[PDB]
Amino acid sequence: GLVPRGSHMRIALMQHTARPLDPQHNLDLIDDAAARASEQGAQLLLTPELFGFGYVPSQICAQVSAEQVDAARSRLRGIARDRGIALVWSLPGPEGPEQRGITAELADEHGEVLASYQKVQLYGPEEKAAFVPGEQPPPVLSWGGRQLSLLVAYDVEFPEMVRAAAARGAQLVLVPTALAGDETSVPGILLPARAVENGITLAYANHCGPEGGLVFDGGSVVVGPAGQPLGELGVEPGLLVVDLPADYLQDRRAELHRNWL
Amino acid sequence: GLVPRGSHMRIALMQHTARPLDPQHNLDLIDDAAARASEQGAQLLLTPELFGFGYVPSQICAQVSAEQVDAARSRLRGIARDRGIALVWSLPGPEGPEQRGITAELADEHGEVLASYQKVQLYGPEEKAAFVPGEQPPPVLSWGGRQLSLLVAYDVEFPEMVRAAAARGAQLVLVPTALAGDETSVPGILLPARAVENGITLAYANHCGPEGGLVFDGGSVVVGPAGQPLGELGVEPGLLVVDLPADYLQDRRAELHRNWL
Ligand SMILES: [Cl-]
Ligand SMILES: [Cl-]
User: Fold this and answer.
1) Does the N-terminal or the C-terminal CB of chain A have fewer CB atoms within 10 Å?
2) Domain ranges of chain B
3) Ligand nearest, relative to CA of residue B160
4) Domain B1-261's class?
């Protein structure tokens, strides 16, 4: 409903089912969600991992060209601009099929790409056969009056990855994902801790339903710094819209910790 | 009841209220618990942080001598031997009042000290006024057919500390604590994640009730590798007895993580 007193940031998460290797269909879904989110006064939409081509790592490696990726990227940039909403998407990276990773990018409501990130923690042998892991820490940047960061899927299950973002100043960590197999412990146990242990908010935007041989969990959720869900979805397609309102980060003995991992 | 098929390790946690600066009283309580635990077929008893002198950091620094600490330590070693149970305790360290930290030690059922550890992550200004922080990673050792480790209180709230133990092979992490102020998120949110994110079991033995100006939470708990409580206490004194039955540790990119904390 109306924008509340004490909140100047409203975000949206898109949860849906992608069709493998059908970017027109899947990008039309992101466009629809971008329009709906903007109508509802959201200033940013987060969408799921690899949504544009579907979560089909081996098929992306075998069949999706770098020109096809760039064409998708250009369409997404255009969605951000034309729907007047900041947009986080996740595509293969821009290099050739043998050299690219899984990425997330944030465009602002003018369509400018503010940040780009390559997934550091690849999940399972199919991802590691299809993609090159990232080697750079998560980006952190000002938008909308806070410091935003990006991570992708499996990354968030590693406390080190979230801590890397929070150490750079992140307040709001945005995470495209693709989580199947009724893995309740990720949103149920790990995300709340990542929020509490850093004092941050995290947004986690999943696929749902039958896609590419898997049944995705849905369960998209925004978790606040107390570890509580600010909003959550179930297993069906939906558009989650949320208004956002111990000193672990200082106390940690990072110079010892770094020697002990 | 009877020792179950498929479990060859039964542990006990002591939850109680200590009297500040009364080691005879508090060590008599640990002796009583050691006896009871052994009667119930437990092979190890875990007891809470600083229990022997009470959780009174400033008063420990002002009033408790190194000879008084050693006298307590010797009594505890004797409890382990005479009650025929492995024992984890937590005392000030052995150095002078200005030079020592908060420690945890494991004695076996013969009274041999197998491992010693000094709290790395001190909590709050009173602890940091009264104690020197530890500089060494958590120890890990074979006992009872598994790899055990020690951490103390606030340490476990840092994912880095638990990961440091798990990286050395820990399977069972034993944590004396002193948690007051209705801090539900520690046992409710953080401990389950520490277990899941490493694939380990954690045991967390708290004070309870009025002690030294604080009201301790109780809530002692053993959490298994799925993040579920294997046993838990409420807010009253008690003796918790539990039978114990993604490849994050391999997948983590530790050589990058270490540069990003
Ligand atoms: Cl960092
Ligand atoms: Cl280590």
Assistant:
1) N
2) 1-261
3) 2
4) alpha beta
